Amino acid sequence: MFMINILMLIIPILLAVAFLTLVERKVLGYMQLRKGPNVVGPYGLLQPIADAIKLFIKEPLRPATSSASMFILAPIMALGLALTMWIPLPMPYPLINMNLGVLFMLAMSSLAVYSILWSGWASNSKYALIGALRAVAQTISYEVTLAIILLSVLLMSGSFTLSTLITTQEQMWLILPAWPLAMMWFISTLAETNRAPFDLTEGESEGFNVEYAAGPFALFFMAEYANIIMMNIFTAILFLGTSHNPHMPELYTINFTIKSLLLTMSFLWIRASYPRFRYDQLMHLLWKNFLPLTLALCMWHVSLPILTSGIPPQT
Amino acid sequence: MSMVYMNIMMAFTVSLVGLLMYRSHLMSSLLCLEGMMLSLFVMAALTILNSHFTLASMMPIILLVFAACEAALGLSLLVMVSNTYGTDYVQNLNLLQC
Amino acid sequence: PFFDVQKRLGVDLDRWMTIQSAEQPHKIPSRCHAFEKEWIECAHGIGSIRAEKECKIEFEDFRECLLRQKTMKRLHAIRRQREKLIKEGKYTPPPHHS
Amino acid sequence: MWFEVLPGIAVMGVCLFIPGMATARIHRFSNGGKEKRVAHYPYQWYLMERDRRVSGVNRSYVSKGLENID
Amino acid sequence: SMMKWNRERRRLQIEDFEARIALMPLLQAEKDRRVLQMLRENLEEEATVMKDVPGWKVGESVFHTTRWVTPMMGELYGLRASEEVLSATYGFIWYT
Amino acid sequence: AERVAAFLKNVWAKEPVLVASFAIAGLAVILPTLSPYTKYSLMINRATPYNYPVPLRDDGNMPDVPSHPQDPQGPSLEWLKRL
Amino acid sequence: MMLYIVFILSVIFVMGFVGFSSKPSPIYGGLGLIVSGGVGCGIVLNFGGSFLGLMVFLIYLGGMMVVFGYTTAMATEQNKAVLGAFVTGLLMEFFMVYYVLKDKEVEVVFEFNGLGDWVIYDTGDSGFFSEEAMGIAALYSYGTWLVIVTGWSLLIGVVVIMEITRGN
Amino acid sequence: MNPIIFIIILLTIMLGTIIVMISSHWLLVWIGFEMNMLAIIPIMMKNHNPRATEASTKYFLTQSTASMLLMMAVIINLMFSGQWTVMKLFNPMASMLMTMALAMKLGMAPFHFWVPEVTQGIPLSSGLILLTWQKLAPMSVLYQIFPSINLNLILTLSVLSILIGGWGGLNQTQLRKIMAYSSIAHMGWMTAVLPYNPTMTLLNLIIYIIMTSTMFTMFMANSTTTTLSLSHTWNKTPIMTVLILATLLSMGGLPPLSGFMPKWMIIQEMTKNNSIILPTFMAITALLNLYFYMRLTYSTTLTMFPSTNNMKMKWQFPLMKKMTFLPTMVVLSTMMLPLTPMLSVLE
Amino acid sequence: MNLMLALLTNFTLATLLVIIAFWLPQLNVYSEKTSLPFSMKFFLVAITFLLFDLEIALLLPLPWASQTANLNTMLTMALFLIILLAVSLAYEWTQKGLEWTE
Ligand SMILES: CCCCCCCCCCCCCCCCCC(=O)OC[C@H](COP(=O)([O-])OCC(O)COP(=O)([O-])OC[C@@H](COC(=O)CCCCCCCCCCCCCCCCC)OC(=O)CCCCCCCCCCCCCCCCC)OC(=O)CCCCCCCCCCCCCCCCC
Ligand SMILES: CCCCCCCCCCCCCCCCCC(=O)OC[C@H](COP(=O)([O-])OCC[N+](C)(C)C)OC(=O)CCCCCCCCCCCCCCCCC
């Protein structure tokens, strides 16, 4: 029954990714006074299928690569880890109930930076490698605030278990006591996922996947779009906890899903509203604005439970 | 002792023998130096975790923190060598007693 | 220590983690706590030269708890005989063991 | 009109709903109508193994009440 | 709101820890019997298997002390089905 | 003081993020030493029984040690229930 | 065969070490140290160390080998001795495995045993906490001196690295 | 460096050594070496030239390799004893690895190859820290583990160090290479008496540090790094030539100078243990050190080498360098023999 | 056993998609085509992340550390580590280490 459980997780993720492309194109269209895809299928519902078929029967693009083995390793790592970050998520019951689920997600997301790095090497382009180094630098920089911000929210939860964030928020969303952290956490997920206004990899006139076109490029796209959903699901569990009724688990999933869709939509909302940062400006945002505030709020959130007698349980 | 110690302790020897026998690249040797730490990290963790030496459980973390800080210094020296000679080959570092 | 500052000042810097019989969080014991207590108490204040021969029984038992060399050899002897009596059809294990 | 964006959103919601609904129902199917036992610490595991022996069958989600007592 | 709720959880955690404390004497007593029983069974198949080996004594300690020594997993489950050995050894670590 | 009433306004206009950071870090260092509820935190961490309370052999001169967990002797957690 | 997971992982751990120890290109050497580090995490996990296992993934692989690969990308240009070394190491590991299984006992400097790692595990565990977590958390109650020296050395690392790289 | 940062780095070099010397736990000993090595590299690269980069790189690779062997000794000693206390090691294999790790850190032969090249490639100020202060921590550990050190191993490193250091210096004209080999020769004397009386290791270490400090200080005063640049000193600072003569004769073990006291007390202790062949071999071989000390006296004090016309411009300016403690060190390094029985303060 | 089986599926599925995505295109049989200077600022950001990462490793066990009876000691050490982490940021900041202008 467990093998069926994994497929009930993997397959809907890829279908959610498939139709997020459609929803992104229509939402941007309506904010831009357009309509978006509405011809291929009724309301564009068949547009994702047309793109998938087209991409996977297009001519391969792979030029001479110095590390052909590394060329195949990057998409596997990117897509294997993207699906692996879903297995501990409580929705409301996790596939793999980990005692250290929060650390597991940080650990797996800190390895996805290799996909960027390996794809830069395997492209045999000195200007693609420079782009990968910039992409790596941005990602690891914003991993510092994700861990410190996440550590500050666990000092009110009392453990690294993801399911204990449900109990911690049984009276009130953690966003109310930790909205300063939620603001910085949310923007970090944008920079972590390389989404606008932080998508300087898409500075056409200003990516490391250029050597991938069709086929493997489609797999990198799925990994990236799978992480946007996962990050926004992580945000909902962490700052917008849903009430869990053991006798009606599906009530949690409906409410939990609605929250995770709205946060995913807001990523599209943000992409339609702002210009993008220069590379140095998104570094100065992290090192000179977020990091000073995150450290100050980590000191405050270590001492706050002690001075209010609100230290949470270990179990 | 247990055949897990046979392989972890043989991992240390492989990394030690790998470190003492340079080929050309300094970076390749810095990896062998960081492989020795991993073998020590695992060897130290197994002994502490098996013996239920609770307070020693922080020792492997301290080992990881200092060896990573040491490794950062090693990369910095490697980067300065590359700027001088364009490559990190250990055969360009013979100005002293050539 | 070469300089015994800790004893002079009466400040504990690292003695809290030197032995596995010291105070632990939540009073969690070590697997060889009883053996180490006996060896440390046998060889207290008599010096290493006397302790190496006057406390050899306590240390040998402690060494056995740590690495379990004599325990494993005895078990290995039991298992070899058992398998030699089954390749020759001369032993039937009981149901609770199968 | 903006409501023509909803059909795409509806498909995403259903797809994202399945993983959490499937896990809840599979756990109850595999654990005799109850939630899957959570054992995060070794004391909780010791009790789960004790239930497996007490069960009579080799399954820890079968409970014995005050009917095994004389 | 978090102070109010976390204090309640600590009160709920003390209640859960006290339920464990009230059962430990019962669980400890049966663990002793299960450990002793498994050692007794091993001491009986050792006599049967090691009756012809010269110089072998059945049930001989490896320690110089007569103090009770908590057995390791290789002495309790030395000759039992590998399924229950795997559950005893790696069951907890692998669970979910 | 024009020195302290004009320097503060300048940083509040040029570096409001750092002013907030230092104010938050400052309170995190000061308030714990002034709060009256810091002592409760320590008392609660001591009232959490992680190990078994091993009983003491009764020699006949230990009036303050309860004989049954429901006797009026021994520590009480009434302060916690009313907190 | 599943009861020997730790030993199976221990062999992969060594084979990965022979990989980057034979010193192929740094891109592939760093790939062999990521695999060995991942297998090293598994061995620590199966001994009850879950926090220590995840520290390797979060710090050793996610933080330290990323910098090694990142530094290789920009500070390195990008054999018949790598192949010879790799063959020698694999043969050395194979003979040890053969003699630690065929005989169940080998002696190289130390006396090893081949019954399986499970024979040494503790048979009693009923606590309501993770023992390694309590030990690691004790760094703040007991390890006051450890924290001061460790924190000081990290601060000095930042100071020292900037001195070295200024170049003037 | 910024002057404040220079002091912070030196205090960290000193703190790491002090941590090693006050530690009862093997982990804190390892941390002290790690902290000490971290803060020594920046002062080895304060000049920012290729030769300093190479010296630091060779120093880093040697010390890091030794530090990993030191950890392996600690973990092996933990497996066989279950304790971390800084004392005799409870396993022969752990003892050898720790001894070889400390031999590499000290630069003893046959792990000596880094000492001459590292010293040559760094300024005199950093060479002084390298050859004097950096030997306090490895000797502190050896002072504590000597009951379990393999006697053959430690005496073999000592004999090799005396031989290699004696032979190595004969072929040198660079002062920093001469001092590096003189360091290897004296390391052998310190460790050869360690099994018999570790109190004569401290005596030899203290006298050597004073004499080495005096030598480097007078090389820094005149900014001299070569034999020929040191042979112009008679025509600039004649007094500094007589002090160099006195300190060089003392380093050679000539009575009635201080540098005779270590050689004198080490021989006394070894013969008490019926060790006659070894002290005789060491004493005679130490004449190799005396030879290349005597060459420097010939070209510095006992003859007047050719000068340069531009030297006449230097006669008009004074020495502005600090030369800290130089008057005290030069007297302690030459006139302490009558106070020899004071060595018991080290007991 | 579930986690091991869960990781195997995710990477096996990813591996299968990668290979078919490389081969499924190679059946159209198309016509034959017949057709960096080191930057020290990128290195410094990578090193600084590492040293901050090692500090984060020491801060990770704070949730467990707040359950101890020596809260006065624990809170001091916890704030000491975070503060020293801020000092590192202050030092790099004032030494023009966080700049990107050459
Ligand atoms: C309580 C009774 C009191 C009396 C006791 C007897 C006295 C014993 C003193 C022993 C301590 C000596 C050190 C402290 C005095 C240093 C003062 C100073 O440097 O200025 C002198 C000072 C200069 O006066 P001046 O009118 O200004 O004329 C010079 C101009 O200012 C400037 O014109 P310049 O630029 O042309 O001058 C350059 C240079 C001339 O430069 C050159 O070009 C000459 C180069 C070739 C000369 C080669 C001969 C070098 C002789 C020294 C050999 C050192 C190894 C010692 C081996 C022991 C056997 C000798 O002139 C010198 O100043 C060099 C002489 C000072 C050398 C300092 C030696 C320190 C190491 C001594 C170690 C002694 C170990 C003894 C054994 C241990 C047991 C206690 O003389 C005086 O005014 C009165 C001071 C009285 C002492 C005279 C210095 C004699 C020291 C060397 C003889 C060693 C005797 C050892 C006997 C051992 C058996 C007991
Ligand atoms: C008793 C109380 C004690 C405890 C009190 C603790 C809290 C006190 C209050 C702290 C202040 C609040 C901090 C907020 C974070 C500030 C970060 C910062 O530095 O800002 C300035 C930074 C930088 O400001 P700057 O660029 O103008 O320059 C500032 C510095 N100077 C002027 C010197 C150059 O601005 C940003 O962060 C903007 C980033 C781009 C954002 C683009 C996306 C916008 C999306 C908007 C929707 C977000 C919704 C979030 C909710 C998510 C829900 C899950």
From Swiss-Prot, chain B:
This is NADH-ubiquinone oxidoreductase chain 4L. Belongs to the complex I subunit 4L family. GO terms for molecular function: NADH dehydrogenase (ubiquinone) activity. Pfam families: Oxidored_q2. Core subunit of respiratory chain NADH dehydrogenase (Complex I) which is composed of 45 different subunits. GO terms for biological process: ATP synthesis coupled electron transport. Core subunit of the mitochondrial membrane respiratory chain NADH dehydrogenase (Complex I) which catalyzes electron transfer from NADH through the respiratory chain, using ubiquinone as an electron acceptor. Part of the enzyme membrane arm which is embedded in the lipid bilayer and involved in proton translocation. It is a multi-pass membrane protein. The chain crosses the membrane at residues 1-21, 29-49, 61-81. It catalyses: a ubiquinone + NADH + 5 H(+)(in) = a ubiquinol + NAD(+) + 4 H(+)(out). The keyword Transport applies. It is an enzyme of class 7 (translocase). Its EC number is 7.1.1.2. It is found in: Mitochondrion inner membrane. It comes from Bos taurus. InterPro entries: NADH_UbQ_OxRdtase_chain4L/K, NUOK/Mnh_C1-like. The keyword Transport applies. GO terms for cellular component: mitochondrial inner membrane; respiratory chain complex I. The modification N-formylmethionine is found at M1. Keywords: Electron transport, Formylation, Membrane, Mitochondrion, Mitochondrion inner membrane, NAD, Respiratory chain, Translocase, Transmembrane, Transmembrane helix, Transport, Ubiquinone.
From Swiss-Prot, chain C:
PROSITE patterns: CHCH. It holds the Pfam family Ndufs5. GO terms for cellular component: mitochondrial inner membrane; mitochondrial intermembrane space; mitochondrion; respiratory chain complex I. Keywords: Disulfide bond, Electron transport, Membrane, Mitochondrion, Mitochondrion inner membrane, Respiratory chain, Transport. Mammalian complex I is composed of 45 different subunits. This is a component of the iron-sulfur (IP) fragment of the enzyme. Contains two C-X9-C motifs that are predicted to form a helix-coil-helix structure, permitting the formation of intramolecular disulfide bonds. Accessory subunit of the mitochondrial membrane respiratory chain NADH dehydrogenase (Complex I), that is believed not to be involved in catalysis. Complex I functions in the transfer of electrons from NADH to the respiratory chain. The immediate electron acceptor for the enzyme is believed to be ubiquinone. This is NADH dehydrogenase [ubiquinone] iron-sulfur protein 5. It comes from Bos taurus (Bovine).
Curated annotation (Swiss-Prot), chain F:
Pfam families: NADHdh_A3. Coiled coil: none annotated. Keywords: Acetylation, Electron transport, Membrane, Mitochondrion, Mitochondrion inner membrane, Respiratory chain, Transmembrane, Transmembrane helix, Transport. The modification N-acetylalanine is found at A1. InterPro entries: NDUFA3 (IPR026626). It is found in: Mitochondrion inner membrane. It comes from the Eukaryota. One of its GO terms (cellular component) is mitochondrial inner membrane. Residues 55-83 are annotated as: Disordered. The keyword Cell wall biogenesis/degradation does not apply. The chain crosses the membrane at residues 17-37. It is a single-pass membrane protein. Complex I is composed of 45 different subunits. PANTHER family: NADH DEHYDROGENASE [UBIQUINONE] 1 ALPHA SUBCOMPLEX SUBUNIT 3. Accessory subunit of the mitochondrial membrane respiratory chain NADH dehydrogenase (Complex I), that is believed not to be involved in catalysis. Complex I functions in the transfer of electrons from NADH to the respiratory chain. The immediate electron acceptor for the enzyme is believed to be ubiquinone. This is NADH dehydrogenase [ubiquinone] 1 alpha subcomplex subunit 3. It comes from Bos taurus. The lineage of its organism: Eukaryota, Metazoa, Chordata, Craniata, Vertebrata.
Curated annotation (Swiss-Prot), chain H:
GO terms for cellular component: mitochondrial inner membrane; respiratory chain complex I. InterPro entries: Complex_I_Subunit_2, NADH_DH_su2_C, NADH_UbQ_OxRdtase_chain2, ND/Mrp_TM. It is an enzyme of class 7 (translocase). The keyword Translocase applies. One of its GO terms (biological process) is mitochondrial electron transport, NADH to ubiquinone. The keyword ATP-binding does not apply. Keywords: Electron transport, Formylation, Membrane, Mitochondrion, Mitochondrion inner membrane, NAD, Respiratory chain, Translocase, Transmembrane, Transmembrane helix, Transport, Ubiquinone. PANTHER family: NADH-UBIQUINONE OXIDOREDUCTASE CHAIN 2. Belongs to the complex I subunit 2 family. This is NADH-ubiquinone oxidoreductase chain 2. The lineage of its organism: Eukaryota, Metazoa, Chordata, Craniata, Vertebrata.
